[PDB]
Every structure is written in structure tokens, then in C-alpha cells.
Design a protein around this ligand. Structure first.
Ligand code: AMP
Ligand code: PLP
Length: 806
């Protein structure tokens, strides 16, 4: 291989010319950067051609607007999409360095927070792999969300300085800079509408390449960085200047801030993307090779990932009507046609709203436009449904209450040609209840796009073991098209293949066990069940339900210490919101139970509790390839979809969960007999809510529940602070809105079936091979082809990029 040789040549010249350092003064970070730069060079060749090919063969451009972009680590994905993974592994070894060591040096891209963020990052790869003409638009947050640190068993927020040493992937484009306008006043001149006396913030773009698997199509991600305009002056004009400089800087500083009026910043953040993005979008349309804006809805697609970029609608109206001199009605039919919405937040309350006063002050022009839109619309409603006063209020963009407020979700539907849902079941609720009146008027608008996960990151990267077990028995083709996993369905009875499936899982379990032993300092039993419950630390996610399970499990080994019980390694990961009092207590409860269960000799190795500190995109790639059991035990009627569960199924993990969200469509895809479904279903939940839930009906009338709960309340797990979980008890007893005790029995007797199925080796791995065979639907490429066809009006892989030279 001359590849292995070539990688070694460029690494040295990068270290010597780009980094300007010799091996004698180079840190492992200097070694990562030199490697990262070598891998980036191979992307550049495609990138330049891909972006010039789009200018040349002018296709319709897709624009994914999102605040969240949970990208994670780039190096590994980049060299796998380039096939150099093996050549680099050999070349890095040849330089007396470990690739795995360098990969761990790389920081997590502090651009996401949860499911919405990863959704974006997966989608971005799929569009690239499917040869699409797409772009990712977002904010270049400098400090991300935060780093989780468990101090004395509690969560401590640490600042994420992931840009301290700088990203070796992103390329700054200060020449493509744009102005974002704020505050000021409006004026109606004979020429047009003019927005003057405005405060200006600079938008500086940073582009990061998005490579496609195998294909020469490498897209671009434009993330904007807030900067302030430069310059006689007094103290009053010095202090305001130095303050304004910094205030602009904290727009692209931290994701989802609280500060209490850090609300205006969150609004400012949204308009910073919207304005910057759209000006750049339009610029590309008019800067295209060879009255002008008629071809706009045929050459531009704008997907509004949740209510965050809801301002794109009145902003596009603004730019077209006030700047481009376009007719309102012409520009409005364009707006509707060039905009598509997606709703993740189920039930009409988590739906984003903003006071009119706050809009009156910050975006006075956008308010006029929104007011105008929410009239030409209401008048059309008064045409179809005359005299219906209560429909008008139910459908208005402007809401009433303690003060007038603009419902951004209404504006998203009124302004979009297609509104979609994340899961079939969820999507129906969006139609039938969330936007009931908008649905009747236009049912053809409302759609569904079931979410997906990229098979490269969530399989080829993290679990190459399981991948190669499918590669030689099917052929690589399954990586392009995931539905080809049903081709291994007749291998449910193949004797040589079944043991080779568990061979991979165990070869992964040991690697993660070593990580667990080294980092957390606990004796890990690899022969035990790898129970996992990694997600947002929230009450509706029911982390406490899994707690109660391990409490009874601990008491069962204390009751019958002789009994040969099924060994486990209960893993609960995730992060609590900084203000969330209850979720912080929940993290403490897990650590309190662990400091009891792990530090006990009667228990030994048949039970280990371990809270996963700093659950990220990098950590998920470690835990999921080595996980036996997967928990998605959320209260039914809450989880809309969820993408986590999908990563497990593909990596050979039996899921436990209620009949809600992604669980419904998985049990539909693989059969409810092949998944540990338990607890109340949506209607039973509805019925219990009709009954009027009481906790004492469950606490007084149970043996091992009473024990487990009065253990927590007594302070059996917090001996030095016996009243530590007072608020946890008081909740589960009086103000528990996610019926935790109502699914206690159901969860445990379900867990008994889980316990017995794992007692048998072949029948567990047989039920597992069903899950891997049915995961095909849950491909991100499937969702992207569905967006490209049912919404964006584009042909997948119709425009392919040829191999260039120099
Ligand atoms: N006049 C032009 N001739 C050839 N390529 C261009 C031109 N303008 C832009 N491009 C391509 O488009 C990319 C950057 O422009 P944009 O797509 O507008 O961000 C570069 O990769 C260029 O190769
Ligand atoms: C996949 C993923 C999620 C989403 O999982 P859910 O169960 O849908 O909440 C969240 N966070 C990280 C870091 C992930 O990798």
C-alpha cells in the first residue's frame, strides 16, 4: 500500500509546515491536528468540485435550518467515508502513535443538546451519501451546552471550551460575512418600507465539509459566528461600545441560555440564523449562472427543523417585498412554496410563543409582516367558515392572555407548503389535535416522516464487528440500503452465524468493561447483563423507574444471598437541565444507590449500578455497541418519536419500553413478541387520568415497593443526609404526573421475562437477530429519500460528482 506511505508523508509535512513543530516538542494534540489535517486534505478535493458542480449544473438547493447540530467527533467518520481508516491505522502505528489515542484527544463538536441535534447531524450525512444538493445552516456556539462532572455524586456544569485549541475541520470565510439588523424604527416611504435607526451585528460564516459514503459528493455546513462592527467618543459611547461588542459575542456563545431575561437573547439567536442564512440563500440564487424570483420555489428548499427558524417566513417576505421590490402576493405564494415545517414537540404547550412587546421593540418590521399574514389568512378563514368567531381565535397567529403573544407554530403552518411529524402516531396527533383547524382546511399540507439514524456512524463506525458479520454474509450493499437486513432473517436458525453474533457483542463488552474499570474504578462482571438507560434526565423519561428496579434487585440478593441470580451492570446515563431541581436529585439518587450496591460484598458481582458521566455523541458510540439490554421506559403519551432506541436495535439490543413513540413502529416492524413491551398504553394512561391517580393505592398495597420507597425516605442510600430525597418521595407519593408506581409491577414482571430470556444464551441471541433484521426501515437515508420525494421535489443521486485532478 502506497496509501499507508502517503498518509505518513503528509502527517510529517503537516507537523513541520502547518503546525511548525518537530516530534521532540509535539504533544498528542499536535499529533491529532497533523492527522486531522491530513484527512481534511482528501475531503477538500471532492468539496471544491461538489460545490462548483452545483454552481455549474444549477440544481434545487436544500437548506436545513437548525439551532442544534450534535455532530460529535469528525476524524473517524471522515476517514471511514474516505476508506483510509485502515491506511491511517497502519500509518499512525508506523509513527509510534495509537490512532485510538488520537481519536480520544478530539473534542465533541459543541453544537447540539439532544435528539433534535443528532437528527440534524444524521440527516446531513444521508443527504451527502444520497448525492443531494443540501446545506446545513446553524450557529457556531463557542462554549457548546456544558460538560457534565459528577462531584460528590451530584451534577456540576463545566464550561465546554471545545474551540480553545480550535477546530481543525472548519474553514472561516470572513469574505462571505453578512449584517444582521436589530431594534430601530420602521418608515413607509413612496419607494418602499424602510427599517432604519437599526443596531447591527455581524454574521461571520465558518464552513465544515459533510462527506458522503463512497460517492465523491461532499457537502458544506455553514455555521455563523456573531461579531460586532468596528470604528469621537466619551465614556457613555465607550461603555456602550464595549458592552455591545460582548452582547453580540454571546449570541454565538452558548446554546439554550437562561440568564431571567436571557429570553431576548434566545430570540436574537433565532433571528441571527434566519437573517444570515436567508441573505446567503438569496445571494446564491441571484449569483447563479444566468421577475427574477419566479424560479425561486423550484431552485430553493427551506426545511424549518422545529419552531426555532420560524422567522424565515416573515424575513423572506421582508427581503422580497422591501429589498427585491417583489409584489406581496407573488412573494407570499413563493414563501409558502419554498418553506416546509417539522414539529417534534407533541401537545400544544411546548410550542414556541413570544410576546408582541418584545417583537415590537426588537423586530418592528417583522411584526407588521406577521400582523399582515395573520389577516389575509383569517379573512380566508372567515370566507370558508363565516360567523365562526371561536375558530378565528383558535387559528390566529396572535394569541391573547396576560399579554398578546405571537404563536410561532401557527406562523410555521400558515407559511409552509408541507408540515410533517416525526412518528406516524405522533403525526396523526399533530393533524387531529395540535393543528385540528389547520388540518381540516388543508389536509394535503400535513404529512409524516418517520425518523432515522445514519448507518455509517450508528453501525459502521461504532460497531465494525457486527458490520463485517453482515458484510461477508450479504455484501457491503446493505450500508447504502439498510432494508437489505431482512436478507439475514433466514439466518435465525444458522448455527455458525448465531455464535458469531454473540462473539462480536462479547468482544465489544470487554472493551467497554476495561473503559468502565479504568474510568469509574468498579469491578465489572463481563458475564453480566449490560442494562442501559441513556437519555435526558427528566421526570417523563422515568429514570426513577429503573432506580426502584435495582433497589428491589439489591434487596432480593440481601434476602436470598445463596440464590443463583442473573448478573447485571445497570447503566444510567444522561444530563440534567441546570435549573431542574428534580433531575439533579435523580442523578444523586443513582450515585447514592451505587455507593451502596457496588460497595457491598454480599452483593458481589451479580449487581453493579454505574451512572455515566458526560453522556455525549462520542460516549454513545462506546456504550451502544457493547449493550445487551436497552431501556426506553418513558410514560405512554409522552415520547413523540425518539432516535436513541433506533441505534440500539441495529447494534443488537433488546429494548424495554411502553407502547409510545419509536417503540410502536419498532414492535410493528419486528413483532411485539420480539420486544419487552410493558406498562399502560396511551388510552389506559388517559383512563387512569380519568380515574384520578393515587399513589397510596400502590404503596400501601405492595411488599417490595413499600420497602424500596421507605428505604429512600429513611435514607438507607443517603445515611449522612437522611432527608436528601424528601422531594423525590413527596413527588412519587403526591405530585407525580408520570405515574411511576402505576407501571412498577408491570415493569418488574416484564423484567422477570427479561431475566429468564437472558438465562438462556441462544434464545436471547435469536430474539436479537430479529431486531437487526427489521432495523432497515429506521435508516436516515430512507427519511431523506422521503423528504426529497414527498416534500422537497428532488431526485436522489440524480446529480453525481465526478473525480477531478489538482
Ligand atoms: N463564478 C464562479 N465560477 C465557478 N465556480 C463558482 C463561481 N462562484 C461560486 N463558485 C463555486 O461555489 C463555491 C462557493 O460559492 P457559494 O456556493 O455561493 O458559497 C466554490 O466552491 C466555487 O467553486
Ligand atoms: C441518539 C442520541 C440522543 C437521542 O436519544 P433519545 O432517546 O431520542 O432521547 C440524545 N443524546 C445523544 C448524545 C445521542 O447520541
Amino acid at each position: 500500500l502506497g496509501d499507508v506511505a502517503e498518509v505518513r508523508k503528509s502527517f510529517n509535512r503537516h507537523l513541520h509546515f502547518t503546525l511548525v513543530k518537530d516530534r521532540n516538542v509535539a504533544t498528542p494534540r499536535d499529533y491529532f491536528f497533523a492527522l486531522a489535517h491530513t484527512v481534511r486534505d482528501h475531503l477538500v478535493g471532492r468539496w471544491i468540485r461538489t460545490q462548483q458542480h452545483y454552481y455549474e449544473r444549477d440544481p434545487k438547493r436544500i437548506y436545513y435550518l437548525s439551532l442544534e447540530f450534535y455532530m460529535g467527533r469528525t476524524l473517524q467518520n471522515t476517514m471511514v467515508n474516505l476508506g483510509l481508516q485502515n491506511a491511517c491505522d497502519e500509518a499512525i502505528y508506523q509513527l509510534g502513535l495509537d490512532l485510538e489515542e488520537l481519536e480520544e484527544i478530539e473534542e465533541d463538536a459543541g453544537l447540539g443538546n439532544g435528539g433534535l441535534g443528532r437528527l440534524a447531524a444524521c440527516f446531513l450525512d444521508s443527504m451527502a451519501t444520497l448525492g443531494l444538493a443540501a446545506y446545513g445552516y446553524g450557529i457556531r456556539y463557542e462554549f457548546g451546552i456544558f460538560n457534565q462532572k459528577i462531584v460528590n455524586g451530584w451534577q456540576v456544569e463545566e464550561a465546554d471550551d471545545w474551540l480553545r485549541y480550535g477546530n481543525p475541520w472548519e474553514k472561516a470565510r470572513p469574505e462571505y460575512m453578512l449584517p444582521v439588523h436589530f431594534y430601530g424604527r420602521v418608515e413607509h416611504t413612496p419607494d418602499g418600507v424602510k427599517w432604519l435607526d437599526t443596531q447591527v451585528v455581524l454574521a461571520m460564516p465558518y464552513d465544515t465539509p459533510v462527506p458522503g459514503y463512497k460517492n465523491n459528493t461532499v457537502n458544506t455546513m455553514r455555521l455563523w459566528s456573531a461579531k460586532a462592527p468596528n470604528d469621537d467618543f466619551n465614556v457613555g459611547d465607550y461603555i456602550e461600545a464595549v458592552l455591545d461588542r460582548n452582547l453580540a459575542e454571546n449570541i454565538s456563545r452558548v446554546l439554550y441560555p437562561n440568564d431571567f431575561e436571557g429570553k431576548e437573547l434566545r430570540l436574537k439567536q433565532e433571528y441571527f440564523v434566519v437573517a444570515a442564512t436567508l441573505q446567503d440563500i438569496i445571494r446564491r440564487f441571484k449569483s447563479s449562472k444566468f421577475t427574477c424570483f419566479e424560479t425561486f420555489p423550484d431552485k430553493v428548499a427551506i426545511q424549518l427543523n422545529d419552531t426555532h427558524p420560524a422567522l424565515s417566513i416573515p424575513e423572506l417576505m421582508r427581503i422580497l417585498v422591501d429589498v427585491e421590490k417583489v409584489d406581496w402576493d407573488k412573494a407570499w405564494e413563493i414563501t409558502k412554496k419554498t418553506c416546509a415545517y417539522t414539529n417534534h414537540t407533541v401537545l400544544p404547550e411546548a410550542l414556541e410563543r413570544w410576546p408582541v412587546s418584545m417583537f415590537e421593540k426588537l423586530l418592528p418590521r417583522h411584526l407588521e409582516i406577521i400582523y399582515a399574514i395573520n389577516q389575509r389568512h383569517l379573512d380566508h378563514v372567515a370566507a370558508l367558515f363565516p360567523g365562526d368567531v371561536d375558530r378565528l381565535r383558535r387559528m390566529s397567529v396572535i394569541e391573547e392572555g396576560d399579554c398578546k403573544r405571537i404563536n410561532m407554530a401557527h406562523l410555521c403552518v400558515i407559511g409552509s407548503h408541507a408540515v410533517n411529524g416525526v412518528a406516524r402516531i405522533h403525526s396523526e396527533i399533530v393533524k387531529q389535535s395540535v393543528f385540528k383547524d389547520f388540518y381540516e382546511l388543508e389536509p394535503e399540507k400535513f404529512q409524516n416522516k418517520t425518523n432515522g439514524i445514519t448507518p455509517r456512524r450508528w453501525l459502521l463506525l461504532c460497531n465494525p464487528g457486527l458490520a463485517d458479520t453482515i458484510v461477508e454474509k450479504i455484501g457491503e450493499e446493505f450500508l447504502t440500503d439498510l432494508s437489505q437486513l431482512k436478507k439475514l432473517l433466514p439466518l435465525v436458525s444458522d448455527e455458525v452465524f448465531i455464535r458469531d453474533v454473540a462473539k462480536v457483542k462479547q468482544e465489544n463488552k470487554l472493551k467497554f468493561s476495561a473503559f468502565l474499570e479504568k474510568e469509574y474504578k468498579v469491578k465489572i462482571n463481563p458475564s453480566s447483563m449490560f442494562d442501559v438507560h441513556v437519555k435526558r434526565i427528566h421526570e417523563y423519561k422515568r429514570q426513577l423507574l429503573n432506580c426502584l428496579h435495582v433497589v428491589t434487585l439489591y434487596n432480593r440478593i440481601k434476602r436470598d444471598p445463596a440464590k443463583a441470580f442473573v448478573p447485571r451492570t445497570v447503566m444510567i446515563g444522561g444530563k440534567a437541565a441546570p435549573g431542574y431541581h428534580m433531575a439533579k436529585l435523580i442523578i444523586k439518587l443513582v450515585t447514592s444507590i451505587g455507593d451502596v450496591v457496588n460497595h457491598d460484598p454480599v452483593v458481589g458481582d451479580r449487581l453493579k449500578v454505574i451512572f455515566l458521566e458526560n453522556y455525549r455523541v462520542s460516549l454513545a458510540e462506546k456504550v451502544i455497541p457493547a449493550a445487551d439490554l436497552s431501556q426506553q421506559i418513558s410514560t405512554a403519551g409522552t415520547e413523540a418519536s425518539g432516535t436513541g432506541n433506533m441505534k440500539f436495535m441495529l447494534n443488537g439490543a433488546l429494548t424495554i419500553g411502553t407502547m409510545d413513540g419509536a417503540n410502536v413502529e419498532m414492535a410493528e416492524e419486528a413483532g411485539a413478541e420480539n420486544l419487552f413491551i410493558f406498562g399502560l398504553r396511551v388510552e389506559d394512561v388517559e383512563a387512569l387520568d380519568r380515574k384520578g391517580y393515587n399513589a397510596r393505592e400502590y404503596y400501601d398495597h405492595l411488599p417490595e415497593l413499600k420497602q424500596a420507597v421507605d428505604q429512600i425516605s429513611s435514607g438507607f442510600f443517603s445515611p449522612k443526609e437522611p432527608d436528601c430525597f424528601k422531594d423525590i418521595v413527596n413527588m412519587l407519593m403526591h405530585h407525580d404526573r408520570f405515574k411511576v408506581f402505576a407501571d412498577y409491577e408491570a415493569y418488574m414482571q416484564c423484567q422477570a421475562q427479561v431475566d429468564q430470556l437472558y438465562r438462556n444464551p441462544k434464545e436471547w441471541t435469536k430474539k436479537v437477530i430479529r431486531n437487526i433484521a427489521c432495523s432497515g426501515k429506521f435508516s436516515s437515508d430512507r427519511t431523506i429519500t422521503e423528504y426529497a420525494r414527498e416534500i422537497w421535489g428532488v431526485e436522489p443521486s440524480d446529480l453525481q460528482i465526478p473525480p477531478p485532478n489538482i
